[PDB]
Design a protein around this ligand. Structure first.
Ligand SMILES: *[C@@H]1O[C@H](CO)[C@@H](O)[C@H](O)[C@H]1NC(C)=O
Lengths: 30, 49
């Protein structure tokens, strides 16, 4: 997986993609 | 109940949302979360009547 964002300090929306060999979980909130 | 952002340090890319609430730095002294000279809230409320 990969994390994305600008500052990653719970001040802006941070894209997160997680693979666990069963699905892909994508979330946007900090 | 309706707010619009009037102060920002750049221009948005197309189809972008920014909902951060930090005090805008319009001068030299840091705001540190406290309003004052050259330090304004980025979101101004509408005045619908
Ligand atoms: C995204 O964040 C960076 C980091 O401060 C900033 O320089 C840039 O202007 C931001 N992008 C937009 C479209 O505001």
């Amino acid at each position: 997986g990969w994390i994305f964002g600008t500052t990653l300090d719970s001040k802006t929306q941070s894209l997160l993609i997680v693979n666990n060999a069963t699905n892909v979980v994508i979330k946007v909130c900090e | 109940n309706y707010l619009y952002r009037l102060f920002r340090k750049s221009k948005l890319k197309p189809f972008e949302r920014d909902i951060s609430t930090e005090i805008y730095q319009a001068g030299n002294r840091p705001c540190n979360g406290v309003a004052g000279p050259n330090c304004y809230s980025p979101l101004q409320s509408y005045g619908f009547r």
